[PDB]
Tab-separated table of C-alpha atoms and ligand atoms in Angstrom:
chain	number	residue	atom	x	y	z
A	1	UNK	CA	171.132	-0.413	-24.230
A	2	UNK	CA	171.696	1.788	-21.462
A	3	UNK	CA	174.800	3.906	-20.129
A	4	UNK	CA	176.739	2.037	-17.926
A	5	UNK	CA	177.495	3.903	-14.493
A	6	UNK	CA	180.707	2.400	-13.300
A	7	UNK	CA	181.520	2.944	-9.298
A	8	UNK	CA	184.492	3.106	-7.189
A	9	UNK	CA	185.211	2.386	-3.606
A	10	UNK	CA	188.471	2.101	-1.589
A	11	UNK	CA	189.809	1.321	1.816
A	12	UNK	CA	191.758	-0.847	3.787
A	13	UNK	CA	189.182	-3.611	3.783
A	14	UNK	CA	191.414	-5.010	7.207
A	15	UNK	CA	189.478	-7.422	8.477
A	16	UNK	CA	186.211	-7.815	6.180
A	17	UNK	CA	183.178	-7.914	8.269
A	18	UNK	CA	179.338	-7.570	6.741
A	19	UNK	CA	179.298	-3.768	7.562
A	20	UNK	CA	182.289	-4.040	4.922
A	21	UNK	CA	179.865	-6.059	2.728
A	22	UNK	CA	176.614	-3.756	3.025
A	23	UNK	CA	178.678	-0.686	2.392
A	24	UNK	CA	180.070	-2.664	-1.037
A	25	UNK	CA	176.088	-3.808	-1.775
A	26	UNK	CA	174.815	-0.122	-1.150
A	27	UNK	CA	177.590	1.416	-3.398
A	28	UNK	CA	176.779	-1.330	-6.765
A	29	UNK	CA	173.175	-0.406	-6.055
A	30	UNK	CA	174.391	2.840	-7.330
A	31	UNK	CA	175.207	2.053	-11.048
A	32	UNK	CA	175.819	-1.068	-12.782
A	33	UNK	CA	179.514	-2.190	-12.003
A	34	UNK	CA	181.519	-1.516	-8.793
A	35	UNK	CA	185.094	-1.213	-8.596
A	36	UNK	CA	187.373	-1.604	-5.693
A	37	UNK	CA	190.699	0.036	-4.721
A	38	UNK	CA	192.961	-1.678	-1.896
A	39	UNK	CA	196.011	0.338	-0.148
A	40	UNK	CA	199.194	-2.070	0.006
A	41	UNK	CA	200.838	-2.492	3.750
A	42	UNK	CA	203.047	0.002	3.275
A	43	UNK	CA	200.910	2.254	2.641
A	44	UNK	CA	198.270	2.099	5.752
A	45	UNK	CA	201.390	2.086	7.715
A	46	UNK	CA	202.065	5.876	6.898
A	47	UNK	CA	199.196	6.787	7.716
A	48	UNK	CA	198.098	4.438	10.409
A	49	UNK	CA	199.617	1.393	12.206
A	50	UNK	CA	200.623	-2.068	9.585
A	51	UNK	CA	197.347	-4.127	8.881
A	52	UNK	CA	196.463	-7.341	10.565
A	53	UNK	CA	196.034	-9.106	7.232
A	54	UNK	CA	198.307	-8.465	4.457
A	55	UNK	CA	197.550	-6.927	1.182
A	56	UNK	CA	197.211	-10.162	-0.802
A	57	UNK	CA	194.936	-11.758	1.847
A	58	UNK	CA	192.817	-8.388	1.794
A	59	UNK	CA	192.756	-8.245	-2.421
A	60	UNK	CA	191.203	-11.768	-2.139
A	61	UNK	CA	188.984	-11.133	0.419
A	62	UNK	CA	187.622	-7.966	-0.834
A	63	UNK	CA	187.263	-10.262	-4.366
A	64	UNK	CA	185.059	-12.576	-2.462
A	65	UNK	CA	181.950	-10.444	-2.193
A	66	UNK	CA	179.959	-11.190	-5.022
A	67	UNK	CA	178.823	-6.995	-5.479
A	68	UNK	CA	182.889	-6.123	-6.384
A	69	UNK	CA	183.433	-6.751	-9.940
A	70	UNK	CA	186.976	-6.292	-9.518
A	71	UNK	CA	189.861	-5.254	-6.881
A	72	UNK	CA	192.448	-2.608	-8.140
A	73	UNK	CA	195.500	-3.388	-6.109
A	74	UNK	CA	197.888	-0.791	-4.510
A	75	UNK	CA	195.112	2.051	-4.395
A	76	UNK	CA	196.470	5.731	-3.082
A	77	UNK	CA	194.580	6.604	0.367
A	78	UNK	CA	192.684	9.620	-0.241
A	79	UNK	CA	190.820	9.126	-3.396
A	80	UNK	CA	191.388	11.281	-6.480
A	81	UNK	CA	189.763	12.586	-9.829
A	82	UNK	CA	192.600	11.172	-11.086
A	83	UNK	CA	192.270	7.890	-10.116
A	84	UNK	CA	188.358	8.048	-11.023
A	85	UNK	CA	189.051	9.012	-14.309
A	86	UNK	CA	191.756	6.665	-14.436
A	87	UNK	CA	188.695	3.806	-14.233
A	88	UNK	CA	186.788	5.074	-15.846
A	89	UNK	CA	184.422	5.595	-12.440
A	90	UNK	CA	181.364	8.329	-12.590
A	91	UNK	CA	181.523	9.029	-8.660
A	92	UNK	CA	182.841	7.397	-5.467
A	93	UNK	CA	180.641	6.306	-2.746
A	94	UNK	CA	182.461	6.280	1.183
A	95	UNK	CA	180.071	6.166	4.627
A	96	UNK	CA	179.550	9.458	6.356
A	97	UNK	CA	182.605	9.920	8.279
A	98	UNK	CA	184.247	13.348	9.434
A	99	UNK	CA	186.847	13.612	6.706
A	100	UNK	CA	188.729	17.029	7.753
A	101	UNK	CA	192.558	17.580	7.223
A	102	UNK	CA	194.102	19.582	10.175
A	103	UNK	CA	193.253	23.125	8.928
A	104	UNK	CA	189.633	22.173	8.947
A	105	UNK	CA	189.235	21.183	5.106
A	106	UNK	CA	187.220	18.117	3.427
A	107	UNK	CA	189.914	15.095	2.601
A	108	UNK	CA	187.594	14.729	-0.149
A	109	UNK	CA	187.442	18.684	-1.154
A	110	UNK	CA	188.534	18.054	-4.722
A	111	UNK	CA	185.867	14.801	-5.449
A	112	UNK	CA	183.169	16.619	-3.473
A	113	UNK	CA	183.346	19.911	-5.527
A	114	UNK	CA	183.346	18.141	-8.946
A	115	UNK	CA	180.038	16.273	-7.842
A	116	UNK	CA	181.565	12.560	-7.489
A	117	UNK	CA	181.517	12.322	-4.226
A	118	UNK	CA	178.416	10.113	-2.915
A	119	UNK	CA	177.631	8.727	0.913
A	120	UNK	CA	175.667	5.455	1.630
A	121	UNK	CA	174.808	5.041	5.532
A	122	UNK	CA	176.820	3.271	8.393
A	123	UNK	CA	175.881	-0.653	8.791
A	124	UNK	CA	174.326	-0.694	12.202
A	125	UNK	CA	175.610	-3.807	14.589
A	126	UNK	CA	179.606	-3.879	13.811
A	127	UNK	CA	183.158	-2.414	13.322
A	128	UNK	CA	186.575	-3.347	13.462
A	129	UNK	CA	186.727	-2.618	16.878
A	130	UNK	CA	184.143	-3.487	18.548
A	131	UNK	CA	184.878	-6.811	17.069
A	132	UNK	CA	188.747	-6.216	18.500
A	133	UNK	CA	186.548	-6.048	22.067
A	134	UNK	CA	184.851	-9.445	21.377
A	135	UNK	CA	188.251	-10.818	20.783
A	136	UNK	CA	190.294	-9.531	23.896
A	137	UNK	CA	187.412	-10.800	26.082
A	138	UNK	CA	187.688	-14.423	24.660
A	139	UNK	CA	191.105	-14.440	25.390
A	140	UNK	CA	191.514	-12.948	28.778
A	141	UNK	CA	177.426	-17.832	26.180
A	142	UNK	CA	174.586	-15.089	26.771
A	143	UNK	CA	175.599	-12.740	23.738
A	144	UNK	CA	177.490	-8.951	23.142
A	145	UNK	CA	175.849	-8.489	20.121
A	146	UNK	CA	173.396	-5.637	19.498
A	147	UNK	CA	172.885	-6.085	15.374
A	148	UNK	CA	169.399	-6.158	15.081
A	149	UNK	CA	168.446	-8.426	11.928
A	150	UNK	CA	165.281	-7.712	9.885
A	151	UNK	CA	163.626	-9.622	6.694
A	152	UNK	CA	164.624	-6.634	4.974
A	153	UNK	CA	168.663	-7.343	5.827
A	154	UNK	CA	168.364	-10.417	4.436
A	155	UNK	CA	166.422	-10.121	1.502
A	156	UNK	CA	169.346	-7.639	0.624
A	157	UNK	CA	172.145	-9.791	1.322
A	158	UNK	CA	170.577	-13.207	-0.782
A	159	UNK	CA	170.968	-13.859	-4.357
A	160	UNK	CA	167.071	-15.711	-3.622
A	161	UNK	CA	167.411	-18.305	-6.434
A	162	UNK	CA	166.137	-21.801	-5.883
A	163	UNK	CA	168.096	-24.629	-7.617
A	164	UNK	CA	167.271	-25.249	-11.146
A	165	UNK	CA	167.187	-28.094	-13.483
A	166	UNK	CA	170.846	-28.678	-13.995
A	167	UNK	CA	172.378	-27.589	-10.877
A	168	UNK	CA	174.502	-29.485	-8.985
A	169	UNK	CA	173.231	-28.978	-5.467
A	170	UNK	CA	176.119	-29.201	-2.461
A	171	UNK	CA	175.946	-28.794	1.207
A	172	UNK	CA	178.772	-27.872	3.790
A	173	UNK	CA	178.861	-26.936	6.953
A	174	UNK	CA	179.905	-25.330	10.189
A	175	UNK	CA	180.451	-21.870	12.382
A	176	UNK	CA	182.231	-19.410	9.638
A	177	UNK	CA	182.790	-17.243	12.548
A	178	UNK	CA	184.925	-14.137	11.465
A	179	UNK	CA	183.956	-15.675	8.015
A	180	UNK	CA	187.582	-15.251	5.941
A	181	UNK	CA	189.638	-15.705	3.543
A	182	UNK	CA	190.392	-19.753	4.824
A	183	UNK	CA	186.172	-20.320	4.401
A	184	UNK	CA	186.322	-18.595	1.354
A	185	UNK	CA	189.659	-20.744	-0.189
A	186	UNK	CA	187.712	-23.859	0.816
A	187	UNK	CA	184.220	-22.245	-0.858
A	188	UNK	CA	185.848	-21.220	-4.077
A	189	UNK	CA	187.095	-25.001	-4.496
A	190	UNK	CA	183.876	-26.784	-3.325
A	191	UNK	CA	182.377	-24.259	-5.936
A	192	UNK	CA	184.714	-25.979	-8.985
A	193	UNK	CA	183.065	-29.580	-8.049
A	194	UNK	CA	180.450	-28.984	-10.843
A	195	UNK	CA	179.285	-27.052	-13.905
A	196	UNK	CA	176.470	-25.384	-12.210
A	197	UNK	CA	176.944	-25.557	-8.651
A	198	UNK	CA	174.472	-24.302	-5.936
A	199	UNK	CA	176.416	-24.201	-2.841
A	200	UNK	CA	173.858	-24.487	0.864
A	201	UNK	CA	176.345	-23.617	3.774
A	202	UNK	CA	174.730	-24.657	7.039
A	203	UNK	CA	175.347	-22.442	9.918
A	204	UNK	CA	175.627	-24.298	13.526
A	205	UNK	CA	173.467	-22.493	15.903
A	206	UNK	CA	175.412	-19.834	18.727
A	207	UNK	CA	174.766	-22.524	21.468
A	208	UNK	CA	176.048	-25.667	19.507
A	209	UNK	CA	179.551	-23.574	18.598
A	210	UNK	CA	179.896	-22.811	22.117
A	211	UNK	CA	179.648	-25.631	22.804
A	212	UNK	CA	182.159	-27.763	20.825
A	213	UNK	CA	184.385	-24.382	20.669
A	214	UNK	CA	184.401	-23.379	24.305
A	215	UNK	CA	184.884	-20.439	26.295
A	216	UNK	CA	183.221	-16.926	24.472
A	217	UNK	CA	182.792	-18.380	21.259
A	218	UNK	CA	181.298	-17.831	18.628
A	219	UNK	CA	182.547	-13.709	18.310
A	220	UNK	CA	180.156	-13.742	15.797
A	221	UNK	CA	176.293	-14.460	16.077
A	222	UNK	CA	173.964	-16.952	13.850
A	223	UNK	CA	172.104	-13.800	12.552
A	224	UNK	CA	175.581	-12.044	12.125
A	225	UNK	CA	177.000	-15.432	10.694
A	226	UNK	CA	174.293	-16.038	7.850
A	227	UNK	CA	175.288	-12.137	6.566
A	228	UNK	CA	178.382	-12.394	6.162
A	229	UNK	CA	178.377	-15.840	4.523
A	230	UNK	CA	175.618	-15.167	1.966
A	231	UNK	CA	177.654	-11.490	1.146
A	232	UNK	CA	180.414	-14.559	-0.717
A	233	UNK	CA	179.770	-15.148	-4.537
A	234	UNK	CA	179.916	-19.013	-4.100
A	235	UNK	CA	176.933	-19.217	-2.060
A	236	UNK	CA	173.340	-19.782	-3.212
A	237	UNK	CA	171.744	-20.154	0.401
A	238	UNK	CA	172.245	-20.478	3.775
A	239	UNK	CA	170.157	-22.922	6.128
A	240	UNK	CA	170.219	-20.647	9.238
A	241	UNK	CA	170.529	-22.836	12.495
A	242	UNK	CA	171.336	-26.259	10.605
A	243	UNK	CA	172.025	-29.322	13.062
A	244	UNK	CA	175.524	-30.233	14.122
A	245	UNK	CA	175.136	-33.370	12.535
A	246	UNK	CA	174.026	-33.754	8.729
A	247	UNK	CA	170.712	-35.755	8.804
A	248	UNK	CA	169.183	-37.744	6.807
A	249	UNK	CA	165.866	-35.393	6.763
A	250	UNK	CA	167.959	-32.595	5.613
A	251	UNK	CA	169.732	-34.177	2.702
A	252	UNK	CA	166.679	-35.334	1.645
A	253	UNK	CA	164.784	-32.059	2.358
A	254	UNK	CA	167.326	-29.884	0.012
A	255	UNK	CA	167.606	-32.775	-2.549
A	256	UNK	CA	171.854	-32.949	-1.847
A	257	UNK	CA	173.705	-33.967	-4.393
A	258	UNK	CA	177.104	-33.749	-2.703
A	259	UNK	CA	178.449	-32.980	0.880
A	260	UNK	CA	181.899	-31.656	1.646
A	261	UNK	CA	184.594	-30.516	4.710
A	262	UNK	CA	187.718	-29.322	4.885
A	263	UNK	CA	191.063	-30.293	5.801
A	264	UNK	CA	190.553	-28.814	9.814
A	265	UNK	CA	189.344	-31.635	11.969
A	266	UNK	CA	186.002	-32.906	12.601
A	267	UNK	CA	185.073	-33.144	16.169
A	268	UNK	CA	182.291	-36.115	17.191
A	269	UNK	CA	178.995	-35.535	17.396
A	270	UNK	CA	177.532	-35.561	21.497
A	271	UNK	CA	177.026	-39.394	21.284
A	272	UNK	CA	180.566	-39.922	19.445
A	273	UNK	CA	179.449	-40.185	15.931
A	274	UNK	CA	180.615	-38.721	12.956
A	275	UNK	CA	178.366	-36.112	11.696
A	276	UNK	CA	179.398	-36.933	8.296
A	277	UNK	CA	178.245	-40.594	8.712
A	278	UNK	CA	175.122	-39.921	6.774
A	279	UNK	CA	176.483	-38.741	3.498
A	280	UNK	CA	179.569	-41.003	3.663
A	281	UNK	CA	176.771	-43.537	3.867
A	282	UNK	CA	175.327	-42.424	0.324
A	283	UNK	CA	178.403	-42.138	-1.191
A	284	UNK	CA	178.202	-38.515	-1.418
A	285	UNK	CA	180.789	-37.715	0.839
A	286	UNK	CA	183.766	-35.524	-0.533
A	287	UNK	CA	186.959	-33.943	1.342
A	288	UNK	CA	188.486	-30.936	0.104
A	289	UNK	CA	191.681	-29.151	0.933
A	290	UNK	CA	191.420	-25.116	0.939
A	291	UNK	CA	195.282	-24.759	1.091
A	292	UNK	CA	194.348	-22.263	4.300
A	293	UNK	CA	195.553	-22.824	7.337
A	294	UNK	CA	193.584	-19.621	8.892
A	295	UNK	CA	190.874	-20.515	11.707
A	296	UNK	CA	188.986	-18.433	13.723
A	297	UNK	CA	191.721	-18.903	16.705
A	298	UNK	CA	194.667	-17.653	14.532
A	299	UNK	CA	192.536	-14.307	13.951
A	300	UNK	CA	192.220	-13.719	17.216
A	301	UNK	CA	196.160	-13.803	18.006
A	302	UNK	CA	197.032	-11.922	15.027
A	303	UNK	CA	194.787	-9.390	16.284
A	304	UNK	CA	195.739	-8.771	19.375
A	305	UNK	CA	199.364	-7.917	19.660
A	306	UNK	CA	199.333	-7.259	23.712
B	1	LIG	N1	179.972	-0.822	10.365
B	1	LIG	C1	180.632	-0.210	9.379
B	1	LIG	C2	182.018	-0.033	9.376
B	1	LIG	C3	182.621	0.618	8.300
B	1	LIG	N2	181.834	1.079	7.216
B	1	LIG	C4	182.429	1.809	6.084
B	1	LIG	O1	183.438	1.135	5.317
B	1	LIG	C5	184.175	2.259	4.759
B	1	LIG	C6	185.463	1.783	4.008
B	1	LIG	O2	186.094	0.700	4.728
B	1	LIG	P1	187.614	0.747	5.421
B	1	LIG	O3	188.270	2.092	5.476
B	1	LIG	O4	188.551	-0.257	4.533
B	1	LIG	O5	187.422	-0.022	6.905
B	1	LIG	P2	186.825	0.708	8.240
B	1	LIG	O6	185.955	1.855	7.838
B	1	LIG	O7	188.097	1.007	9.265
B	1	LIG	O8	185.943	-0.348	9.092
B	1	LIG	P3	185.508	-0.117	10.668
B	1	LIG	O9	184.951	1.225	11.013
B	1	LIG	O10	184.492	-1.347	11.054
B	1	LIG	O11	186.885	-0.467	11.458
B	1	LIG	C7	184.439	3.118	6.026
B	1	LIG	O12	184.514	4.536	5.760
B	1	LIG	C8	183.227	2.820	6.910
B	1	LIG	O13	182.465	4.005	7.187
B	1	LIG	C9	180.458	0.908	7.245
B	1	LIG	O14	179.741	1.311	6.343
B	1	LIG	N3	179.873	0.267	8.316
B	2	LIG	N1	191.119	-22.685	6.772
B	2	LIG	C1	189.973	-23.383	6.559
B	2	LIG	C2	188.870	-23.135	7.362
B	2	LIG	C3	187.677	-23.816	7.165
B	2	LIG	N2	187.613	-24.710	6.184
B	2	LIG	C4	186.348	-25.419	6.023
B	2	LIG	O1	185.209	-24.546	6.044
B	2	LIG	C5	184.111	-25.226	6.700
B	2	LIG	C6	183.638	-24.417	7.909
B	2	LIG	O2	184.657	-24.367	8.925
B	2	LIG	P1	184.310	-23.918	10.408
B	2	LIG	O3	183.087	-24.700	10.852
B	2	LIG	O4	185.516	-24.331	11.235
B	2	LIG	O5	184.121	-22.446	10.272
B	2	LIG	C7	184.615	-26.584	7.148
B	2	LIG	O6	184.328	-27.567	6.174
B	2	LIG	C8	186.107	-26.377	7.205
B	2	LIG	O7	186.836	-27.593	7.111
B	2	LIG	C9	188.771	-24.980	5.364
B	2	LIG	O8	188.785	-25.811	4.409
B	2	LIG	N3	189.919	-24.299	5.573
């Protein structure tokens, strides 16, 4: 038995994109347990402006990503030996930032100096803001997006497991653009439909969303998509570019043992159809209710205030 090396993070976590998610991955890679402080509203408010998503939505969220162990609510900003010690945390682990108060000291002076201070690197391809830009021009399909996705990204983000003997295999489907809390609500349900489940979430390809979404969406792309939906703890797999409508060659392909949606509507297939026709069909069909009402559309207008 080895020494456990317990980790700390904290931030806002307003807004959790896959930069969010890699930053969470890269710090667990650095011991054996990672721990996760939140700031309440209040809070970011004295510092900076009130959060888009409230403290309760950002606990859960942050709780989502299968590399946090566990969320300690109502974190202080700046991050203290105290509070380390508190957890019983080794070190702390932030991206590279220029942390400087307004004399020209470290924020992190304190941490740095007692040798509990570590960095992991910026994700490339994403950040609040530029995702506040994707936003604002949707609301005022070639592509914005510069991530650049590799084997390597991927291989990162995937728990790689195939089903095994015993495992109740179950498909859903869909964009998860600006994949939240709402996906995750309906997720962590479909996840309680067996003993063992393996969850496959199919991702509609950028020109399919477009389509049946309109104007700039998706904000998010398929590459960007199949990150930050494979970063959740209730996933075992992601097909990436699944058809809009759920086949007969694909249930049969994954060996499905269930099929579920949501409470948000289902919009027909091209030629009027239901895409669920297939499993409904089987008898394999099930409907689940998240208890979210949050979409894609509301993010958007609780992000942009102007
Ligand atoms: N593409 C990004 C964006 C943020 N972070 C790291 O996530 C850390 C903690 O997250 P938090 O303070 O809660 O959110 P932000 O950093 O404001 O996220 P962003 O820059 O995208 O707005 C930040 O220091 C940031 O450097 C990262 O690694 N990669
Ligand atoms: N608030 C939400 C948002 C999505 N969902 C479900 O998550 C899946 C993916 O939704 P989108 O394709 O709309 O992203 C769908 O089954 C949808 O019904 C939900 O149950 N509650």
């Amino acid at each position: 038995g080895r020494r456990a090396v317990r980790v700390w993070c904290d931030g806002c976590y307003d807004m959790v994109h896959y930069g969010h998610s890699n930053q969470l991955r890269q710090a667990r890679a650095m011991g054996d347990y990672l721990i996760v402080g939140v700031h309440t509203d209040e809070e970011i408010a004295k510092h900076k402006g009130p959060p888009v998503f409230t403290q309760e939505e950002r606990y859960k969220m942050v709780q989502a990503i299968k590399w946090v162990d566990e969320v300690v609510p109502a974190a202080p900003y700046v991050t203290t030996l105290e509070t380390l010690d508190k957890y019983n945390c080794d070190f702390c682990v932030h991206g590279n930032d220029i942390t400087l108060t307004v004399d020209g000291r470290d924020t992190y002076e304190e941490v740095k100096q007692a040798g509990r201070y570590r960095e992991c690197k910026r994700t490339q391809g994403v950040s609040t803001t530029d995702l506040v830009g994707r936003m604002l021009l949707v609301t005022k399909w070639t592509g914005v997006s510069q991530f650049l996705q590799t084997s390597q990204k991927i291989i990162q983000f995937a728990s790689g497991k195939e089903p095994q003997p015993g495992e109740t295999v179950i498909y859903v489907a869909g964009a998860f653009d600006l994949f939240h809390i709402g996906h995750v609500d309906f997720l962590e349900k479909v996840h309680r439909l067996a003993e063992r489940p393996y969850i496959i979430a199919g991702l509609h390809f950028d020109q399919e969303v477009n389509h049946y979404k309109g104007k700039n969406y998706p904000i998010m792309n398929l590459h960007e998509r199949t990150l930050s939906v494979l970063a959740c703890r209730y996933v075992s797999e992601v097909v990436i570019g699944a058809p809009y409508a759920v086949t007969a060659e694909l249930l049969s392909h994954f060996k499905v043992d269930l099929v579920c949606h949501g409470k948000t509507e289902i919009i027909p297939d091209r030629d009027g159809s239901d895409p669920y026709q297939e499993p409904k069909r089987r008898g394999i069909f099930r409907q689940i209710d998240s208890g979210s009402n949050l979409t894609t559309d509301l993010i958007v207008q609780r992000i942009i205030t102007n």
